[PDB]
Design a protein around this ligand. Structure first.
Ligand SMILES: COC(=O)CN(C)C(=O)Cc1c(Cl)cccc1Cl
Lengths: 237, 300
C-alpha cells in the first residue's frame, strides 16, 4: 500500500521502482495586469522521476506550450504527468520497467493508475514520506536546463553523480534528501555551503561538487545545522 | 389477481412480499398470499425468527407459472416451487381462500410504489443475473456475492451483475485517459448503453434490481452495483435528457422506500454527495436531491 518509515529499505532492494514527483510540472509566475487584475504566466516545468536505487533522474521537461489553450491546468498537470510517466514506462524494455511507481502526492494515484491500466502488474503507491523533491529546481543545473527548453524534452542526470562508487543507495538517497531538504528550507544558504570552496568543482556530467568522503561528512553536517537553523528561525526556538 | 399459496408455516418467520411484511408464528395456520398484482415482478422473502442471519427470497412473475412456497425441513428454508398441474393448483388456491388462510397483498390504490421501484425490472433479465434456469423464479439472499466481488467464490450462486469499473480498460479509451475518467459519457453511452445493455430500460432494470436486493436482503454487492450504476450516470457530462428525468424518479422512490433506520448501511456517503453536489448531474436530480436533503441530511 503506502510507503512509510516502516518499509523505508524497500526503496533500495532489487525490485525496480521509480518515485514520481509532479510538484514542478505546472509552474507559474503571478503578476498584475495593466487593468490591475492578476494573471498567471506559465514557465517551463519538469516531472521528477527518480530510481532511488540507481540514481537515475528521468527529467521530463514540460514546456509551457503543453498548457496552451487548456483549462483546469493544476488538474491537467497531474494527467500530463501520468501520461509522460506511462510513455516513459512503455518506452523502457520490459526488464527495465518499474515494478512499482511511488507518487509523492496522492492526487497522482488515480491519474497514473488510469494511464497505467496497460500495466496491471505495476503497483502504483502513495507514500507517507515528506520527500523534498520539489527542490529539484534548486539544483542550479536543473533550473538552468528546464528553463532553456524550447520544446518538450527528456533529459537524463545521475542525481547521485558517482556516489554509488563509494556509498550504498541507502546512503546516497539520504544524502540526496538532506541536500534537497536544505535547499528547500534555505536555498541561498544551502548553495553557499555547497560552493563556498572554489577548489571543489562540479563535473560536467554531475549535479553536485566532487567532495571527498571527509568533505561530504562536513557538508552533510553543515546542511543539518542549516535545517536546524531555519527550524529555529521559523519557530523562534 | 394471483396467489402464492404456502403448504404450511412450520417455523416462525417474518415473510416479506415486495415492500410489505408480516409475522408468521411457528405452525400458524398460514397458507400464503393472495391478490398479488399481475403485471409486475414480485419478491417473496424470508427472515427466520430464530436466526435473522440469511434473509432470503424469490423473485418471480405470476404470469410465468403457478408458484407456491413449501418449507423444506432438510434444507431448512422456505422454498419456492412450481406446480405444473394447473388444475391441482387452482383447486388448492380455491380451498385456502375459502378458508381465508391467506393474507392479501395489501396494495393501496393510490400507491404506485411497487410499480415505481420495478418499472424497468423484467424476470427475463433477473434470470440472467441470477443463473438457475431450471426454475422460472430466482433465489437471492444476503450472502450471495457478485461476479465482480469474486474477481477481487462459487460461480453458480453469484449475482451476475454487469461489471462496472471506472479504472478499467473498458471504461477508459487509450488517448482519452483524463477525458474518459473525468467525463464517463463514453463508458455510459457507448460501452454500457449501446454496447452491453442495448438501451436505458435494461440499464435501469438492473439498477432497480440491484437496489431491491440491497434493500430487501441487505445484499452488499447489490448495493455496490446500485451505487456504481448511479455514479456512472452522474459522472457522465452527456446523458439523454429522458434518462436523467427517469433516473431522478427512480432514485426518488428508492430513497422514499428505504427504511429510515437502514440508511447508514445502504447509502454510500461519497457516492451521494458526489452525485448530488459535485457531478455533472448535480442539478438534474431535483426530486432525489429534495427527498435526500429532507430525509437524510446527516449523510450530507
Ligand atoms: C532507454 O531509455 C533509457 O532511459 C535508458 N536508461 C534507463 C538510462 O539512460 C538510465 C540512465 C540515466 Cl537515466 C541516467 C544516467 C545513467 C543511466 Cl543508465
Amino acid at each position: 500500500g503506502a510507503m512509510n518509515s516502516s518499509n523505508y529499505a524497500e526503496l533500495f532492494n532489487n525490485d525496480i521502482k521509480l518515485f514520481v514527483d509532479d510538484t514542478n510540472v505546472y509552474r507559474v509566475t503571478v503578476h498584475k495586469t495593466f487593468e490591475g487584475n492578476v494573471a498567471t504566466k506559465a514557465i517551463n516545468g519538469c516531472i521528477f522521476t527518480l530510481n532511488p536505487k540507481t540514481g537515475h533522474l528521468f527529467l521530463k521537461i514540460i514546456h509551457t506550450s503543453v498548457w496552451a489553450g487548456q483549462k483546469r491546468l493544476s488538474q491537467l498537470a497531474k494527467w500530463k504527468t501520468a501520461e509522460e510517466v506511462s510513455a516513459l514506462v512503455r518506452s523502457l524494455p520490459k526488464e527495465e520497467q518499474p515494478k512499482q511507481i511511488i507518487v509523492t502526492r496522492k492526487a497522482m494515484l488515480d491519474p497514473l493508475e488510469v494511464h497505467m491500466l496497460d500495466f496491471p502488474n505495476i503497483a502504483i503507491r502513495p507514500t507517507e514520506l515528506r520527500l523534498p523533491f520539489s527542490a529539484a529546481m534548486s539544483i542550479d543545473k536543473l533550473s538552468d536546463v528546464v528553463m532553456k527548453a524550447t520544446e518538450p524534452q527528456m533529459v537524463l542526470f545521475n542525481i547521485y553523480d558517482d556516489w554509488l562508487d563509494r556509498i550504498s543507495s541507502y546512503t546516497a538517497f539520504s544524502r540526496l534528501t538532506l541536500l534537497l531538504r536544505a535547499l528547500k528550507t534555505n536555498e541561498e544558504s544551502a548553495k553557499m555551503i555547497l560552493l563556498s570552496d572554489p577548489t571543489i568543482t562540479i563535473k560536467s556530467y554531475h549535479l553536485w561538487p566532487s567532495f571527498t568522503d571527509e568533505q561530504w561528512i562536513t557538508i552533510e553536517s553543515q546542511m543539518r545545522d542549516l535545517i536546524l537553523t531555519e527550524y529555529g528561525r521559523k519557530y523562534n526556538v | 389477481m394471483n396467489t402464492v399459496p404456502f403448504t404450511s408455516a412450520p417455523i416462525e418467520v417474518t415473510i416479506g412480499i415486495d415492500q410489505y411484511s408480516f409475522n408468521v408464528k411457528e405452525n400458524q395456520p398460514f397458507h400464503g398470499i393472495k391478490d398479488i398484482p399481475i403485471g409486475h415482478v414480485h419478491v417473496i422473502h424470508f427472515q427466520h425468527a430464530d436466526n435473522s442471519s440469511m434473509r432470503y427470497g424469490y423473485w418471480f412473475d405470476c404470469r410465468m407459472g403457478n408458484f407456491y412456497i413449501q418449507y423444506d425441513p432438510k434444507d431448512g428454508l422456505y422454498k419456492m416451487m412450481e406446480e405444473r398441474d394447473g388444475a391441482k393448483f387452482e383447486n388448492i388456491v380455491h380451498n385456502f381462500k375459502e378458508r381465508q388462510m391467506m393474507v392479501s397483498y395489501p396494495k393501496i390504490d393510490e400507491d404506485d410504489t411497487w410499480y415505481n421501484l420495478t418499472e424497468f425490472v423484467q424476470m427475463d433479465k433477473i434470470r440472467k443475473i441470477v443463473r438457475k434456469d431450471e426454475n422460472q423464479f430466482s433465489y437471492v439472499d444476503s450472502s450471495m456475492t457478485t461476479v465482480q466481488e469474486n474477481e477481487l467464490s462459487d460461480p453458480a450462486h453469484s449475482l451476475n451483475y454487469t461489471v462496472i469499473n471506472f479504472k478499467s480498460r473498458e471504461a477508459i479509451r487509450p488517448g482519452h485517459e483524463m477525458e474518459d475518467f473525468l467525463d464517463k459519457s463514453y463508458y455510459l453511452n457507448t460501452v454500457m448503453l449501446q454496447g452491453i445493455f442495448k438501451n436505458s430500460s435494461n440499464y435501469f432494470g438492473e439498477l432497480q434490481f440491484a437496489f431491491l436486493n440491497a434493500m430487501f436482503f441487505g445484499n452488499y454487492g447489490s448495493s455496490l452495483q446500485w451505487h456504481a450504476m448511479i455514479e456512472l450516470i452522474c459522472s457522465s457530462a452527456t446523458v439523454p435528457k429522458h434518462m436523467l428525468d427517469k433516473l431522478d424518479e427512480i432514485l426518488y422512490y428508492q430513497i422514499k422506500t428505504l427504511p429510515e433506520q437502514y440508511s447508514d448501511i445502504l447509502l454510500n456517503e461519497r457516492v451521494w454527495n458526489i452525485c448530488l453536489y459535485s457531478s455533472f448531474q448535480k442539478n438534474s436530480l431535483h426530486n432525489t436531491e429534495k427527498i435526500m436533503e429532507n430525509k437524510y441530511p446527516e449523510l450530507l
